[PDB]
Amino acid sequence: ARIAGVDIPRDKRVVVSLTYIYGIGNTTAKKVLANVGVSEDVRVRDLTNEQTDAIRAEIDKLKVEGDLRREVNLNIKRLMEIGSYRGIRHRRGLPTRGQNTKNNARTRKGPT
Amino acid sequence: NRLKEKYIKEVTPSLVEKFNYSSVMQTPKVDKIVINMGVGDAVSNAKNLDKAVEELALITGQKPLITKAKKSIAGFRLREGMPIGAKVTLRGERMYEFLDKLVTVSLPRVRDFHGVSKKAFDGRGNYTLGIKEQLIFPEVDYDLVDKVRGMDIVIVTTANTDEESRELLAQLGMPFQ
Amino acid sequence: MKQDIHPNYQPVVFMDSTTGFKFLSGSTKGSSETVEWEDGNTYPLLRVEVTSDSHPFYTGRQKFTQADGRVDRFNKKYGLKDE
Amino acid sequence: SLKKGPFVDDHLMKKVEAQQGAEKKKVIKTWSRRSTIFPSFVGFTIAVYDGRKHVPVYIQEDMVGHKLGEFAPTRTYR
RNA sequence: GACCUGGGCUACACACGUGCUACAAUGGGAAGUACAACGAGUCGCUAGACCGCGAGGUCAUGCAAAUCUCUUAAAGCUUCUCUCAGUUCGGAUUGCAGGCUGCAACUCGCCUGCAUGAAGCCGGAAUCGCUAGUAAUCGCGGAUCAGCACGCCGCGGUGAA
Structure with a gap:
């Protein structure tokens, strides 16, 4: 719940929905989407399990935490x-x- | 545990050295550890003891009581029967494991590092060595504790004079200044 | 021990960041990693940063290249410029 | 942003130096404005001057980055 | 009366005046693509090149002037985008990392980058300016100046009822 931390919602595309967590501006988002080789996809998030796990593990390479608040x-x-x-x-x-x-x-x- | 082993191995014959005891029964042991969250503010709002007991249940291996009043003080707004504080006694082997936690972990995790103040005398083998903060123990949660109060420890021995208790606590860690 | 109304405890073996003292007991818990026979067969996860030797009340004066993060946060960036 | 290192005056150094192996002195009268702190200045006891008063303050090892200007609050809002 | 150091006129329980930025679809974000006018320049403006996420850093060429630079202007135009939300609107506040002049940016300079993202969906009573290159919007230059402008002085683009 959802995939990493909490609440990565659908109905928006990938660079939009990933901004919704404590730790993503826009440069982090574009660099993480560049590290996998993905796209906007599309205006609703319809990623696959390979892609979600890859972008899940790449965020774990950062300070993106709820303890980032701490x-x-x-x-x-x-x-x-x-x-x-x-x-x-x-x-x-x-x-x-x-x-x-x-x-x-x-x-x-x-x-x- | 460690501290009965130290009594059996090294502490007792060194006591028979440094005071010339004629029998082993003359050696002073340790009996109690008494802990007192003196809150005094449950009279204002009763949810102050409701987390002091929560902290003491983690720190000790017991639950505390709730203490009565025996008086009626006008200044602090007191009558009889008022919930104020909370005792925890310790006996048996949980004496020595809690003292192991005190010697190893706790006492070196306080700012203004000096260890133990050397004047707690009372003449008769009792060093009440209080605690200023609460965040000292490893089991303390920053996401749960708010207030910055502290503890009480009443070390109770069967020693007559404080020359004996100093040597016992010297042979039981206790970083005096 | 009066029944049901006393808190949780298991004799948890200590560790350390440095040199790992493994002797003691505890009360709180976690995910067990080294259940150890030479001590209580319990958690290891009490993994305190303090040896009670690391503080200079027992071992002696050992802090000149003490090199710990926030210490280096000033003493590495201009600390390479220092030395 | 002081990209070529720290800045401490050399007419700050000239009060005492022999307190390196002994227990330190108590009088450090200065101006305490320009100079920052870099790790050779840990654990002294300095009378930080605030335009009127050389206010005494001693040093912790993590009171370490900023200048001597945090501890001269020249507003007097009481 | 005079010399010097450090501080202060930059405080804040509050009320009033003057300006800047928004409350998004005639819009935000990304890409490619044109046209001005005034004035300034010797310890002053910088051509080109290399490197950098950038504020910029280095080597250096022209310039005491219709010649060299500031300087290829923004609104402009074409494609995608988002799909009505406190929102890819908004951009204050706060940590971290920096860049530049200053002997020295704590009190007390400007700017960059990362992380943060508040109010605010056109504002009662009342009150202000303006009769056409005007009102409304958009940029550019100068004075004082090591450094610092939402202020002042001036010019030009689109162009109303």
Whole structure:
């Protein structure tokens, strides 16, 4: 469920449906479809078991995980827990090069 | 297990060396390990003990109790009969296997690395050596634990003075500073 | 032991990332790999990163080329530039 | 992006050096703005200056990449 | 009054004014394919070549000017595509890896790449500009400037009721 992680849905073609997981942008998708030798196929996913297993094993060559979320969490956990001045404002969502916000909290929290 | 074997092999005749005991019955053993999740916040919301027991059941080999109140404190909003904390005693051979886990795994997995503070005296062979975090044990799940509280350990011996307990814990790992 | 109301336990043999101490027991479980006769015939999967020798309270001062990931994350990219 | 390595001034080096085999000193008065950290600067105790106060802070080995500018917060929002 | 270091005018429980980008089918994504005007250039613009996912890196040729460069402009045109969704719309926020000038990008520069993907489906009361190369849309150049523009000043394309 489905083939790798969860929820690779049909009714869309292959480069579209693979974007739906935490770890695929578009360059990862085109490179993984280039590593097998496949195509758009077609506008509904009608792959074969050879093709699905090949593109299943090639994604396993990456960081494409649900622990990739945990990888991000341990990244920002390294961040916020040294001192940390970047943790104080990391939780207040302002970038480490600064953005100088007195009305740009509506991106994250919506103070209105 | 390991720690009865160390008592039979090396610990007892070294004790008869370093204190000149006239009989083997004079040697001090170890009796208990008492553990106390002192929550104190189930009075606010009762779902705080409901995971402290879940953590203690993994850490020990038992289930804890739920402790009563015996008083009625105005400041912490206490009456009689209030669920506050949870004891776990340990006897038998699960003493020594839990102590094996304590000597090997746990004590070197704490930040500000120093091991064991040397002042826990009480004069009479009891080193309450508390625990600050909860993530120390191998069986701790980051996907389950939220709060950053800690434990209690009450090492209980039959030793008279603390010169004896220091040598016992020196012959049972226990990284003093 | 009072019946039915005590948690799960099996005497799980330890391992390590380095040198593999194989003596002890445990409580939690997994997929068994080396049921071992010289110890308890149980799981091996308690495979802790700590030997209680790796920390410099027992063996001595051994961290100069300690070469561990996040350590090398700074000390390899400019660490080749360092040395 | 400082592609030709780190940057630490040489008028930062000149307070003490003999604390390599002994237990280190406590006074490190500086400016603590420009210089980053690279692994020869682990485990000292530096009075990081924030424009008004050389605020003391000691070092962990993973407080290692960024400059001495995280630990001079010059905003005072309390 | 004067010299120097470091900080600050770039904060944020909030309210108001001015601009940029969207809420997708006259559209997004991929491929191939044309036509402007103004102005700038010596420690300044870079021809060509090689390498790189790229920001770019190196060797270097013209240029004190209707000659060399900025510079082959975008909307344009032809094929495929998606098929109405919070969506191949949208593109903020956040980790990682970088590139460039600066003695030095934490407070506090710009840009690239990877991973992330929020609001937002045309906005009440009210209120603004405009009578034709105008309104609406689309690019380009300059000032100050090591570096930094959704601002300012100027030009040109398509072209309304």
